[PDB]
Design a protein that fits this description.
Chain lengths: 436, 448
């Protein structure tokens, strides 16, 4: 919103005009009148935005040449050109050479303010998404998978991605889109698992809300693009039917709508269920299944690609540090082999969760110290007492204490009795009363 | 980006010109000439972008009134206006009423393409941000969390330097950003430097910037922070040579870039954070006390998760939805049984640790009946074993005690842990544990 803006123009009245409007708005303004004075200002402190006279006469660099030098020094620094009456061609060329936009003399305030609000807003947006975009394996299976993606992507066929939960099907779907002919169209996702079965039709098909406002459903939003249906198996009965029509008709009704909307979508499905078995029990539709499954893509379980795990661990650490400010640590080779040999029912999500867990537990140890196999949980390699009121908690505790002591004495009740502080028959009676 | 662009203009020749230039470029175009045709096209299908004649002669609604209706229907659908020579005041007014930008007749292709491309890009980024935000993944009504909000408010209007102090994985960065948002620098930059994360080799460059080999310049954080606030996350991990330089910056309000000679002037308000007291930093030996005092003119304490256990259910519930979006896992009800464990734990790693454990639970119950409650036996050792619990051969010190002594130790530990769980509220603790209030007071004295 407020910014340190540098105004470079060879005319005293323009610098004064621009600087004054921008200051009046809340910005901080600096001025220059040629290449040297502009580059000296930039050197003093990089500004947030630059207004640059496109001609800039009586200067060592013309306006475009200066633009080039600015962009070389600060690639991400937005620059809006100030152009003359009917120098549209030259202005347009400035944009090819790196300028964001231009404003044409003469102008009053509102026009300039708006040009500047836009340049800053878009610049800000570019930086938020660039950061967020920060926040792929050697094995046979993953080479086959890459190979599969590349063959299947440039077709126009519906894809069904199959594999277990957590194996990273969404990533495969985005890969497909990136190499498809719809790569510059939209990529829209529907988490069929996640959305309430009630709201599912509104997410898919949209609707007119009470105010007159419209919710554009995912099909409509995906027009010209790809729709990725995640875990198609969690789709309701009436919703399956209605998607079947869409695949064939290429048309649908909005919830509560009468208009039949035409779209041109390419659908990618995924599932970790066995759908053929769901057909057999009448839970999912056969005809729907076959149309969604024309070309299949299989995503390998972590256990199918064990070779990849070290680099995956290494990768998730780089990323977890980004996401949480924790200096990444080295994993010790005994613990790494235990990671490498687990079955990973939750696959990549599960592996990430565990790596994140180790980094949290070892946050604030000597950085040269290794993550050891001691730290991994019981799954790798009924009721809690705290949920119980006093009488019941104490009874759980007596029971489990007695069982523990009994095992520690190898089943010898008389020895257990003596140690725990009871007469033998009384231990037997107590054990029975606690349900053993 | 190719896109579905509706073109709305009362002149056949303008629609033709626009739709044709846009088509040559690869877009899919549709056209209309008045409100009824424009709204029917939007009802047939929602376009990605609208060009709209600012005047729109021969129409039920003029261009401005049509802009109100389009925006009401589709608030995020960008609309670029087509205006005439000298219509700037009206164009400006269109922007106030929701238009993204305008183009002024006469125009040829290049100029029209640029306006389209920009409008599509900006609209794309607005969505791609909010989408990437959901795909990455201050809550609470506790006494402590109310205190923190009240403190943020009292402190934000100062000009003075803030030191935020609190345990790791508490949400200190968020506290920083809530302070920035209520300050007089809310419209300036907020810049973060995580001292722990940056290799100390690169710490000077990250902070103070440098001229790279190409001629390309790297703007350091301090310089980027000009006009705003710079957040020095975990200052303790800063090298002494960097400490010395920050001290000069605080008082000179100036600095040299790595390898540079210009003294860059800046106007930054520094907010700092750490997990340790002053006594701690002296004993560690790393960090200068004079600097510490100057970075901590106004203190803000971020309470540990154990000091606000009352918020654990809201945070559990909150993190489930976050995770449910970020990872495609259906959110599930945590059983009251498992919530009691979660709530009773002291969370040495605070919000990060809690979140990571909620993620864990949700991954481990991924292929279950949607009704079936999440249970405590899926929690790791560090959560379950630090609390009063059913013993096991593993626990040498319980196993060395006879039954009554073991039981009495357990009652004590249990009651203290439940008191803590309910944030010290005796009445509620008593209600849960099965006791009347005075009886609970009397039992506590009887056990020490
Ligand atoms: Mg000039
Ligand atoms: Mg017209």
């Amino acid at each position: 919103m407020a910014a340190d803006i540098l105004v470079v123009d060879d005319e005293v009245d323009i610098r004064d005009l621009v600087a004054g409007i921008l200051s009046d708005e809340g910005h901080e303004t600096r001025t220059a009148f040629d290449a040297d004075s502009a580059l000296a200002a930039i050197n003093d402190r990089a500004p947030r935005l630059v207004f640059l006279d496109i001609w800039l006469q009586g200067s060592r660099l013309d306006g475009l040449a200066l633009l080039d030098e600015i962009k070389k020094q600060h690639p991400e620094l937005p620059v809006v050109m100030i152009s003359g009456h009917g120098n549209i061609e030259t202005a347009v060329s400035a944009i090819r050479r790196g300028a964001y936009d231009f404003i044409e003399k003469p102008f009053k305030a509102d026009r300039l303010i708006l040009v500047a609000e836009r340049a800053l807003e878009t610049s800000k947006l570019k930086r938020e998404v660039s950061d967020l975009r920060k926040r792929v394996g050697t094995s046979l299976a993953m080479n086959q998978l890459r190979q599969t993606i590349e063959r299947v992507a440039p077709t126009n066929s519906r894809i069904m991605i199959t594999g277990p939960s957590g194996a990273g099907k969404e990533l495969v779907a985005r890969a497909i889109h990136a190499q498809s002919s719809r790569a510059n169209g939209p990529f829209v996702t529907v988490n069929a698992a996640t959305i309430t079965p009630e709201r599912m039709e509104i997410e898919l098909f949209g609707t007119e809300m009470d105010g007159g406002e419209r919710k554009v459903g995912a099909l409509e939003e995906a027009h010209g693009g790809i729709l990725y249906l995640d875990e198609v198996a969690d789709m309701p009965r009436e919703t399956q039917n209605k998607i079947l029509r869409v695949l064939v008709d290429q048309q649908f009704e909005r919830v509560g709508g009468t208009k039949r909307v035409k779209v041109d979508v390419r659908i990618i499905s995924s599932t970790a269920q066995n759908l053929e078995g769901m057909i057999a029990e009448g839970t999912f539709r056969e005809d729907l299944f076959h149309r969604l499954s024309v070309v299949p893509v299989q995503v390998p379980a972590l256990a199918a690609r064990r070779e990849d795990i070290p680099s995956l661990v290494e990768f998730f650490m780089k990323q977890i540090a980004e996401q949480a400010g924790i200096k990444p640590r080295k994993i010790g080779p005994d613990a790494m082999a235990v990671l490498q040999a687990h079955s990973w029912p939750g696959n990549l999500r599960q592996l990430r969760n565990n790596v994140e867990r180790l980094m949290i537990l070892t946050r604030g140890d000597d950085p040269d110290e290794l993550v050891t196999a001691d730290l991994l949980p019981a799954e790798i390699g009924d009721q809690h007492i705290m949920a119980l009121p006093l009488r019941e908690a104490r009874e759980r505790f007596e029971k489990e204490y007695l069982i523990a002591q009994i095992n520690r004495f190898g089943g010898n009740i008389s020895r257990t009795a003596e140690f725990v502080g009871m007469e033998r028959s009384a231990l037997h009676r107590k054990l029975k009363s606690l349900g053993v």
